[PDB]
């Protein structure tokens, strides 16, 4: 066979994974079942680090301790649509319950008359997105180092019946050791089988989402294929100016690869970017092991990645606590808190 000895080690390794995930699910459930840890005036606001339709993320400094954090601020009056609301509750509850080396750590959450707040660990190395766009593309070993962390993170999340649903370089921060921190759980959801919301980012949507089919955690493995392609090529596989054109390309079932992609890489991506769910890697009898044991990952020491023992390909420069040099600049708008509570009943659970 392909493995000689090496097969016994891999099997024992797989059994240890099971053991780890069983303990991880016990810890998750304790926090999921039995979960206002601060207020706004406990923080100095320093700089906007990112913006979206519903609010912004700011670097803040805790007045008492002097620790720096990333504060996600959501305007309750922009979180209007039904699924926008449910998703905000998913995000908070999931983040407070998970624990994994490549997932950002939530520190505080609270709300006031106008906004919802989630205060998480600050990751000063910046978004993968901006490093990727600056250099163009990552070499295959570099992309593989990041991909391995996502594989392990999705193995963890899926074992807790959590689907992530917004994988992309914008959501992956680089920490001071050069490892990944997944940092936005706004589309994550606990799903025991299928779910039906039409949501995500166009370039990363699995075909079954676009086709309004009930779908499962395999959409994350499709998105992993998009991510690895984008990291190694510098652009994603389904690439067009308008969302409707992107959707047509995704559903077609056709992917073209750069001539510099290794044959091992193309093989992996053809099995991830597989429209047929009975054939998509991650969704088969052997689950995530079809991915972890693929030839493209032959050099990957999965345990060593988890334990953060592998030397990173890139270490971001940091000038000191609070440094924002690895982030882009954004327009700064004052945080105004209304005198009257807004949307109290719709966010009573937050």
């Amino acid at each position: 066979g392909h493995m000689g000895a090496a097969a016994a080690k891999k099997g024992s390794e797989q059994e240890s994974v099971k053991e780890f995930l069983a303990k991880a699910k016990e810890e998750f459930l304790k926090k999921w079942e039995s979960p206002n840890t601060a207020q706004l005036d406990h923080f100095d606001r320093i700089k906007t680090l990112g913006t979206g339709s519903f609010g912004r993320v700011m670097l803040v400094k805790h007045k008492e301790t002097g620790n720096h954090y990333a504060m996600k601020i959501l305007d309750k009056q922009k979180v209007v649509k039904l699924k926008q609301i449910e998703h905000t509750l998913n995000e908070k509850r999931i983040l407070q319950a998970v624990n994994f080396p490549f997932l950002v750590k939530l520190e505080f959450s609270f709300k006031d008359n106008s906004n919802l707040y989630m205060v998480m660990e600050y990751v000063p190395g910046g978004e993968m997105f901006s490093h990727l766009r600056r250099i163009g593309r990552f070499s295959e070993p570099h992309a593989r180092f990041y991909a391995a962390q996502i594989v392990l993170t999705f193995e963890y999340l899926h074992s807790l019946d959590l689907i992530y649903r917004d994988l992309k370089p914008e959501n992956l921060l680089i920490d001071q050791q050069g490892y990944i921190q997944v940092t936005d759980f706004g589309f994550a959801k606990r799903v025991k089988g299928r779910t039906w919301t039409l949501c995500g980012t166009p370039e990363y949507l699995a075909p079954e989402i676009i086709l309004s089919k009930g779908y499962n955690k395999a959409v994350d493995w499709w998105a992993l294929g998009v991510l690895i392609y984008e990291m190694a090529a510098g652009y994603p596989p389904f690439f067009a100016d308008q969302p409707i054109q992107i959707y047509e390309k995704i559903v077609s079932g056709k992917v073209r690869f750069p001539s510099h992609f290794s044959s091992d890489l193309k093989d992996l991506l053809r099995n991830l970017l597989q429209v047929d769910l009975t054939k998509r890697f991650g969704n088969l009898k052997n689950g995530v092991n079809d991915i972890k044991n693929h030839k493209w990952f032959a050099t990957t020491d999965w345990i060593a990645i988890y334990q953060r023992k592998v030397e990173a390909p890139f270490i971001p420069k940091f000038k000191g606590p609070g440094d924002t040099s690895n982030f882009d600049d954004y327009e700064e708008e004052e945080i105004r808190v209304s005198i009257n509570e807004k949307c109290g009943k719709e966010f009573t659970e937050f």
Partner: peptide
Amino acid sequence: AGRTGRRQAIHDI
């Protein structure tokens, strides 16, 4: 030709 800037997610397409 495609989108090169940051991409916004959609909560309900």
